[PDB]
Design a protein around this ligand. Structure first.
Ligand code: B26
Length: 303
């Protein structure tokens, strides 16, 4: 994994002084420096003729080096492309698959990926539309007992539960080709504001804990094998909220295990796997602020 502890990780005390020395504008400038760096890798496949219409945004292609390839077939007329990238987690290879919100012409590709990668948990961080801007297609059956057929894959809704900050949907994926069934849990975070970033990270971090626990539970009940299937995480382009969710998970994981973390390191590293991760300086600043807010809630900060 590219996410290893350090070099030069910081303690909470050190992070506090770090952010205080730079202030909000200093953190914003730091994001711009990351932003300016030349991407590490190429985007030929994502921009190649034939895969263009599979991208929700022409300005958000995925890296050739880390893209998730579909093991489709010949004749059926299609490609092995999907705008999705394997992303490492804290001391864990391929902990996530960051991807865009599925398009009607990619719904089947999305589920094929979920099946092939043996995914057990899907994390959605947006609504279908926000402020008139489309961000995700309705790729799953919304109500209990409803089902959608995607060729040889049938997805059925086994139950829905609305929480104060997220919605949990249990789905059954039936592969008629292999004659096998699997259950996947779909989580939709509901508290990310239409504008800006969350005013408090408490709900997002609690949601992360729920996701972590379900992945752990699902893994414990799955058949012997991915070294731990990846968690699919998506937002409109699969870089902003997706990058934030994943960066926080990684930083908090290191913080829990060693009491240290490095936002700059984590984000720089993540951008070499899911290009363009963290889309605005506000989101970047939010990563720092969320960690500091978490520290205060955990009683780790003296003013
Ligand atoms: C610090 O000073 C400040 C600076 C700002 C400016 C700012 O943030 N704005 C940046 C803007 N980002 C942008 O432009 C990005 C571009 C992504 C990076 N690519 C490249 O650039 C690129 C492309 C090809 C090759 C190479 I090498 C690089 N585009 C976008 O903003 C969106 C895609 C997008 C990304 C993220 C999100 C999200 F955050 F909401 P999410 O959490 O759901 O994912 C939503 C949508 N793009 C599009 O709408 C779109 C679609 C089709 C076509 Br053709 C084009 C040209 C654009 C954004 N997302 O906002 C604002 C306030 C400040 O204070």
């Amino acid at each position: 994994s590219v996410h290893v502890p350090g070099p030069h990780a910081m303690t909470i005390q050190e992070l506090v002084d770090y952010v205080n020395a730079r202030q909000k504008q200093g953190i914003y400038e730091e994001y711009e420096d990351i932003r300016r760096e030349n991407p590490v890798g190429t985007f030929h496949c994502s921009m190649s003729p034939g895969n263009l219409e599979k991208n929700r945004y022409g300005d958000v292609p995925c890296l050739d080096q880390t893209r998730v390839k579909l093991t489709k077939r010949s004749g059926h007329t299609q490609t092995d492309y999907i705008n999705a990238s394997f992303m490492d987690g804290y001391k864990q290879k391929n902990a996530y698959i960051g991807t865009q919100g599925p398009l009607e012409n990619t719904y089947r590709d999305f589920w094929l990926m979920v099946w092939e990668q043996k995914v057990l948990v899907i994390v959605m961080t947006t609504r279908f539309e926000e402020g008139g801007r489309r961000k995700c297609g309705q790729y799953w059956p919304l109500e209990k007992d409803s089902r959608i057929r995607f060729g040889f894959l049938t997805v059925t809704n086994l139950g829905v539960e609305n929480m104060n900050h997220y919605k949990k949907t249990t789905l059954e994926i039936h592969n008629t080709e292999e004659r096998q069934k699997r259950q996947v849990t779909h989580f939709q975070f509901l508290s990310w504001p239409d504008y800006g970033v969350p005013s408090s990270a408490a709900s997002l971090i609690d949601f992360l804990r729920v996701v972590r626990n379900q992945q752990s539970l699902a893994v414990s009940n799955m058949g012997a094998r991915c070294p731990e299937p990846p968690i699919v995480v998506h937002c409109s382009a699969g870089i902003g909220r997706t990058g934030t969710f994943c960066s926080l998970d990684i930083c908090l994981a290191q913080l829990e295990e060693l009491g240290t973390l490095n936002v700059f390191q984590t984000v720089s590293r993540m951008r070499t796997q899911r290009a363009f991760s963290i889309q605005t300086p506000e989101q970047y600043y939010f990563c720092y602020k969320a960690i500091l807010e978490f520290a205060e809630k955990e009683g780790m900060v003296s003013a």
